[PDB]
Symmetry: C3
């Protein structure tokens, strides 16, 4: 009965493993860094999956309440997302086990959204105050992750379907999210979830480049531009985001940061904006590094688990 | 003085005729099916046009009230949409008459939206509760239909202008529609119009493929992906949609369903996702078939016309 | 302490200079027209920059209040936008001075938005009634202008980043703007700002064509289509827009009109929709001409400056 959002941790580490993996053909030593990150992410995922299985068996009413909440349900999508990313890692060692994880995560996230995201359209449960960045997780991030994982398995055209579902879902949600943020101050207890606002453009372009064989084209450049705009905005907002202190919820940023790193490797490979690429890759790794150090610190104080 | 929404019937049948037409170069027997559907759609259109002319002549205040309503006005767009689709059918037999119908429908829908859709921006008439799926008809569907009909006539670049008007209008409306649906439960009397939510992506890709010579490219695949997401959501929602019983308003689904079928023929021709294409084509035909059987049933009970 | 919105005047004239510049390779006499417009725009810009410097030095609390307003802040973005366009003009005579102006305007607009646009997401200051067309200026128009100016300097890939920031920001804002306009009647004192609604698609395609070497492709045609839809809507709305009389605020239309003219030159060069291109170019010049005549008239009556 771990907090569900703690899945952000293996998610970010797994995505960062994949970014480093994609540098191996330029810098062979990147593979060891990728492998270490990937093993740590997989180990943490195993632990957190077992904990969540325990929650389901013995704390089921807590899961039921999170599921039916028009806000909290979204974090459940971190489970299949991380499952797919761990599959993508494991593909380097065992394509069969990888493929199983990728399909479980894909079928699971699609079933999840089909059951819950659509149900919101019945009205009367979701309220204006439910308009939170976390909605990107089931609606957008899960589809991008399926897109890139299916492309890894060779299913590029199926990947494009998931890609399009995520990209259009993103464009369709974000307008109402930013209008809500403008009007209604997001309370401090939820502010770390502003980190999820960094994700869409970077997760999108990373998935796109995964499906299109790494071709850095006009769409990719357009996505990077909006991604950087959002990064600058969130940097400016950071003191406000952490008004009430640093917390583990800041791992919400790691998905976007890791996807910035991953897409940077493709831009670099493609000889597009190489200087920006190096900055992005270094910046994202430093920030995730700080998240790791803050987390080790909290673990040493017994301030990690609830 | 038929209900204006009954134009959904010849619309769906006409769009389905065109889908079958596009299979003739793979399966010659498809032409007869296409021709039968096209004749039935054209006959029903003639009847309903004559009925609406009678409404205009002798029930004009009812038309005036529907026109000025910030909700009901949208269904009027079914008239030029169906007019264009009937033109597209008739092109196989008489390109001159077809071209006349296509221009009448194009000029008519553009004049309609220019007069009424823009007027909404004056404020104070449209209310939050006016945010209904039917708004897609004048704002989106009409433009896509002009795009594809103009391309049939050889005006591809003009078609792209209409295409872009519809595509961007879609992306610009849908965000606020889905947020409204999430917050406000759509009352049962309007719920069959949820079928219109299926239309945008499928109508969009069908129009796109009509203009771009059937090239199944990245944009087409992206559109199909979001289209299928919406289909799955609407399937899950179907029991809720029909909470208060099956009704003729369910023909609102037929535009999206027929456009799923039409786009499937192009995907199949292009050897992209052929299995998905077959499923989509068969599914859409079965559902429209059920709509026809339910309609024959209602006609036999004298429960069709008001 | 001129009204900040008066920067619309050199902006529109500068953008129109650039449109004529782009016709020189088809009609050599266009260069003189371009040069005259460009000199007049630059002269007016110099004057208004000096006036605004005087406002900053001696009326600073008025600037501070406009800056912190969640509505009025946007007009400040006209300053760096016009600065960049004047740089683009001056490039024909002095690339070094041009490049300085272009970077000042680019760094300035990016810093401006990063500081102010993001701050809105803290909530509680911006209200639903703050949802005005002027928000396009910092959020959208400034990024497009950087995109095209950077491309002029040879920085095409950097230009694409700014382009994408503007294009996605546009799509993300417009949904909530049009919903607001539908529900809430914009008061007459702000209605001339409806002219800014014309800008996005035309500014977007003009910037795009500047970066992509004038290739009139599917995206360009799609953008033009939505642009024309918006033009038709605004033409229909014009009597309402000017309900309370003609005023200098109507220069808000000139950015979109000039960008219609500029993009028309590219469509014409590309042999796409040449007839539409000629109409667009002539229409936009006539309307800006009328704005100039109305302005000379007001200056002769001493009804220009506050
Ligand atoms: C990882 C995702 C966890 C899923 C939690 C499921 C919550 C479902 O919950 C329940 O399902 C029943 C039907 O099975 C209904 O009768 C209950 O009323 C409903 O609450
Ligand atoms: C990882 C995806 C598995 C999620 C299974 C959860 C669904 C539990 O069952 C379903 O959930 C619905 C919520 O929409 C409930 O209303 C209903 O009980 C049921 O349809
Ligand atoms: C929501 C934002 C979507 C922007 C879509 C970008 C359009 C893609 O742009 C297309 O990309 C191709 C590859 O570079 C080019 O050859 C085309 O000419 C270009 O228009
Ligand atoms: C995704 C960005 C990560 C790529 C890391 C690049 C670090 C390499 O650094 C680069 O090495 C080149 C040769 O290899 C030298 O020519 C360059 O000057 C240097 O900048
Ligand atoms: C198929 C579309 C039907 C169009 C219905 C038109 C409704 C117009 O209605 C009327 O138009 C008059 C001007 O002509 C105004 O004076 C009326 O007050 C206005 O209601
Ligand atoms: C098929 C398209 C024909 C529609 C003609 C209907 C317009 C009737 O006339 C117009 O309608 C306006 C509504 O915006 C009314 O306000 C005005 O009477 C008029 O401008
Ligand atoms: C709102 C969603 C719009 C997504 C735009 C998809 C961008 C189109 O994508 C472009 O398509 C071409 C044809 O396949 C490719 O060659 C380009 O490389 C690809 O980016
Ligand atoms: C749009 C989808 C409709 C296309 C219908 C396709 C039905 C044909 O069926 C297909 O026929 C092929 C040869 O013709 C066989 O090779 C395939 O195995 C079979 O699936
Ligand atoms: C061209 C743009 C004009 C910028 C106007 C800046 C307004 C800033 O204003 C002020 O800045 C101070 C810090 O410097 C704060 O202490 C003040 O309280 C804040 O109002
Ligand atoms: C042309 C761009 C220069 C603009 C400088 C204005 C910023 C003045 O300073 C800044 O403005 C903030 C507004 O977000 C204020 O809250 C703070 O005083 C400060 O961060
Ligand atoms: C928000 C609207 C975005 C629409 C994106 C348009 C997709 C661009 O379209 C792409 O353009 C290329 C250049 O013409 C073509 O070769 C591709 O086949 C076409 O899909
Ligand atoms: C951007 C649109 C502005 C372009 C102005 C075009 C005016 C030229 O006019 C055109 O000249 C051609 C030869 O030069 C003649 O063949 C054409 O018939 C004529 O229409």
């Amino acid at each position: 009965p771990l907090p569900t959002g703690y899945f952000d941790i293996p998610l970010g580490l797994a995505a960062l493993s994949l970014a480093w993996f994609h540098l191996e053909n330029l810098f062979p030593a990147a593979r060891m860094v990728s492998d270490v990150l990937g093993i740590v992410a997989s180990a943490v995922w195993i632990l957190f999956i077992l904990m969540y299985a325990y929650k389901l068996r013995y704390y089921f009413e807590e899961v039921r309440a999170e599921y039916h909440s028009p806000v909290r349900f979204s974090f459940i999508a971190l489970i299949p997302i991380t499952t797919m990313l761990v599959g993508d890692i494991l593909y380097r060692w065992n394509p069969l086990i990888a493929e199983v994880l990728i399909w479980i995560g894909t079928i699971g996230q699609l079933l999840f959204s089909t059951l819950r995201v659509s149900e919101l359209w019945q009205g009367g449960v979701f309220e204006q105050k439910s308009t939170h960045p976390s909605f990107y997780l089931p609606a957008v991030a899960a589809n991008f992750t399926s897109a890139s994982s299916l492309a890894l398995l060779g299913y590029h055209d199926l990947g494009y379907l998931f890609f399009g579902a995520g990209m259009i879902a993103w464009i369709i949600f974000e307008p109402v999210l930013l209008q809500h943020l403008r009007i209604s101050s997001l309370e401090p207890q939820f502010r770390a979830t502003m980190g999820i606002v960094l994700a869409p453009a970077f997760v999108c372009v990373s998935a796109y480049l995964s499906i299109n064989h790494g071709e850095v084209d006009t769409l990719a450049k357009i996505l990077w531009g909006y991604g950087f705009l959002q990064l600058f905005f969130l940097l400016r907002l950071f003191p406000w985001i952490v008004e009430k202190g640093l917390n583990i919820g800041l791992w919400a940023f790691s998905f976007g940061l890791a996807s910035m790193a991953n897409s940077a490797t493709a831009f670099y490979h493609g000889n597009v904006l190489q200087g920006v690429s190096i900055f992005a890759f270094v910046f994202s790794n430093v920030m995730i590094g700080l998240l790791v150090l803050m987390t080790i610190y909290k673990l040493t104080k017994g301030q990690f688990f609830l």
